[PDB]
Structure 1
């Protein structure tokens, strides 16, 4: 009938009718969460006719990985998997395979810019977990492991695989550590205007809103299949950076900071026909993420305005390019602040040179590298980056990390 289109800034929506009158040459791409990139809910198990092939595939890819194969272990493992499936109607990955699977899936992420690290990954095997308190506990160890007092370390903690689908493990937060946003009496909006909806949810589930500009939202875990249980993150576990500029000292007066730990908590890991609906993973920030996206967007903190004011810049003439000047300085701050407070970080420029290196090793390696230009090209200083002038194909391989329908929209409350 028509296609919905959102504008994450103004949150406005439009319905596209025109495409219908398209030609015999409707590309999506420009879409945030497309269905071609999602792996939603389930009711029943995973039809063996499907599971079995994919299961085999993965296993072949796995043993077809190591130098000088283990032909026998390859066959042996093959057999065992087959046998196990036709006995329980599914199968468990060895830890070494899961590890392979986690790194591959990452390596195969069209939208990750630091994939050149793909081999360095910490795998926490949480597949035995069983309760919310156990989740909450593992999330903590991970956070603590990854934060590593500022010297960040990429990790991942793989909870229980999806069985029937009515017994799914799901972290309800978009990310491990993320400030909350309330809508002040006076109509304003403190904190992260982005998490308005989820913050409410947190309240609705009993969270005590410390109404502030930087409140680190509570973990909202659901295990096995039960309702989600609210948990607060141990204030000690969350390492933050206080924003200060190496020049404009009025900058810290701004009262700005941000968490050092970027961990995606609502993605789904698919491998060998299996899928884990909960498996938080973390890397480390790329400057422009905090400086550009989080601080400047109109749907977040939106600080661009006064940061230019305090620079003298004419905040009434777009043509004056103050915004360009402001943002620039904001980013120099973040890079400074992090740098100073010894919290690992990457400026968008070096990031790109390294991805390019990566991309190249990736083609010589397996003749290819899935990339989503749109996402990969830094939000500012684009054509000043190598990747901007680099054509790239975007495709879904496997293993892979799929988005997935927001849990509240698909739950069974009792």
Structure 2
């Protein structure tokens, strides 16, 4: 039972929940691998025991264990797998398992919200044009004209036999990235690969820096085909600064809805290779990482030139000064546009309350310190001073090979 301390206040708690971790992680007594983005590398017999454990926490959370109403559910599952080698989830179980995978996501800082999630059950899906209609229902419901609502849409699980449903884009909204005789990039360098797949699959390229990409959707066994998102379903936010009037002229935008569509939803031993979820942005994700990472839009020196900062010497902290204004512009622009967003202070403070909540509820919370701490002003937030334990619980969102 690891001892975890908060250095700002002095409180101590013990993490008893860690003892129930099973899926072993990357670290050993010899060496710590906590900072690696993708840890390690990306006869059903074992399918039963995973299913059993999940059902036991489902009925643990709700009502009753012991001559209850779920040895019946225990029996139906093992009879289901005995018959067909896989089983189906009750809609409330899929709902509960969806909420738990969010609750167990060590790298997510917004888990104080894990109880409010809209689980669309898309398991009766049959083709790409139908998928695309689920994805569009989600996007409309999530966006909600800027009053954002957490939502996940679960497509049919992996079933031994033939291929699985697959969103080829990493998100539902991604900006194109084009190359030159420079080898430089116009638009988002994170999306240089998928941009040329859309092109090689028929899409006509675009103007440049903020072209929303088409959707590459894949039904089982079929080759993927492109889908164009309706420009009215893709709410974007022009970036302007409250007092730097020239900032709007830089032409920067970002989209409203963060919707990750490449991760794998594992519930009770079932694998859902297509289960896109969405929430709302923390502001530093846009202002600091997306716009200012050297391998992303890399705008930092451009904004410092415009602010007339001393870029000739690092010790003027021009990088720090321009990055703060970029973030102030993000927060300002989303609020003026009435689009849900949350700044890294509000968010980290909420996550501390989540930690105390989870301490009383489950005796701990898995948290990945390096991803909980924001990428600007780390030690200014309380999460910086909070020791944390990182470990894998199921249900879980997990990374997966991309379909190439």
Is TM-score (shorter-chain normalized) higher than 0.5? yes
For the pair 1:349 / 2:356, whether they are aligned, the reply is: no
Q: CA deviation at 1:271?
A: 1.1
SS in 1 for 2:379: coil
SS in 2 for 1:407: coil
Rounded to whole Å, the distance in 2 between the matches of 1:367 and 1:227 is 46
After superposition, give the CA deviation of every residue in 1:226-254 in whole Å (9 maximum; x if it has no partner): 22111111111100100000000101011
SS in 1 for 2:357: helix
Question: Paired residue for 1:258, among 251, 254, 259?
Answer: 254
SS in 2 for 1:72: coil
Rounded to whole Å, the distance in 2 between the matches of 1:353 and 1:325 is 23
After superposition, give the CA deviation of every residue in 1:41-99 in whole Å (9 maximum; x if it has no partner): xxxxxx33211111111111111111455843212111111111111111000110000
For the pair 1:143 / 2:139, whether they are aligned, the reply is: yes
Question: Paired residue for 1:370, among 363, 366, 371?
Answer: 366
Question: Paired residue for 1:26, among 2, 26, 31?
Answer: 31
Change (3 A) 1:90 1:189: same
Q: Does the 8 A contact of 1:63 with 1:70 survive in 2?
A: no
After superposition, give the CA deviation of every residue in 1:211-232 in whole Å (9 maximum; x if it has no partner): 3110111111111222211111
SS in 1 for 2:351: helix
Q: Does the 8 A contact of 1:182 with 1:211 survive in 2?
A: no
Rounded to whole Å, the distance in 2 between the matches of 1:80 and 1:24 is 42
Rounded to whole Å, the distance in 2 between the matches of 1:228 and 1:70 is 48
Q: Does the 8 A contact of 1:136 with 1:221 survive in 2?
A: yes
Q: Does the 8 A contact of 1:363 with 1:369 survive in 2?
A: yes
For the pair 1:173 / 2:173, whether they are aligned, the reply is: no
Rounded to whole Å, the distance in 2 between the matches of 1:115 and 1:302 is 29
**Greater relative contact order (Cα 8 A, min sep 6): structure 1 or 2?**
2
The equivalent residue for 1:322 is 318
SS in 2 for 1:160: coil
Question: Paired residue for 2:194, among 175, 191, 198?
Answer: 198
The equivalent residue for 1:217 is 213
The equivalent residue for 2:57 is 61
State the superposition RMSD in angstroms: 1.5
Rounded to whole Å, the distance in 2 between the matches of 1:349 and 1:319 is 26
The equivalent residue for 2:382 is 386
The equivalent residue for 1:238 is 234
Change (3 A) 1:70 1:219: farther
Q: Does the 8 A contact of 1:124 with 1:158 survive in 2?
A: yes
Rounded to whole Å, the distance in 2 between the matches of 1:318 and 1:35 is 36
Question: Paired residue for 1:271, among 267, 271, 276?
Answer: 267
The equivalent residue for 1:75 is 71
Q: CA deviation at 1:175?
A: 0.6
Q: Does the 8 A contact of 1:190 with 1:211 survive in 2?
A: no
After superposition, give the CA deviation of every residue in 1:281-337 in whole Å (9 maximum; x if it has no partner): 000000001000011111111110121111121111111101110000010000000
Rounded to whole Å, the distance in 1 between the matches of 2:183 and 2:402 is 27
Rounded to whole Å, the distance in 2 between the matches of 1:71 and 1:252 is 65
Rounded to whole Å, the distance in 1 between the matches of 2:297 and 2:198 is 20
- Which structure 2 residues correspond to residues 178-193 of structure 1 after superposition, within 5 A? 178-193=174-189
For the pair 1:96 / 2:92, whether they are aligned, the reply is: yes
Any runs of at least 4 consecutive aligned residues in structure 1 with deviations exceeding 6 A, and if so which?
Answer: none
Please say which of residues 338-347 and 182-191 is displaced more in the overlay.
182-191
The equivalent residue for 2:328 is 332
**Matched residue count:** 377
Rounded to whole Å, the distance in 2 between the matches of 1:357 and 1:165 is 45
For the pair 1:280 / 2:276, whether they are aligned, the reply is: yes
Q: CA deviation at 1:27?
A: 2.0
The equivalent residue for 1:106 is 102
- When normalised by structure 2's length, the TM-score is 0.91
Gaps of 5+ in 2: 1-27
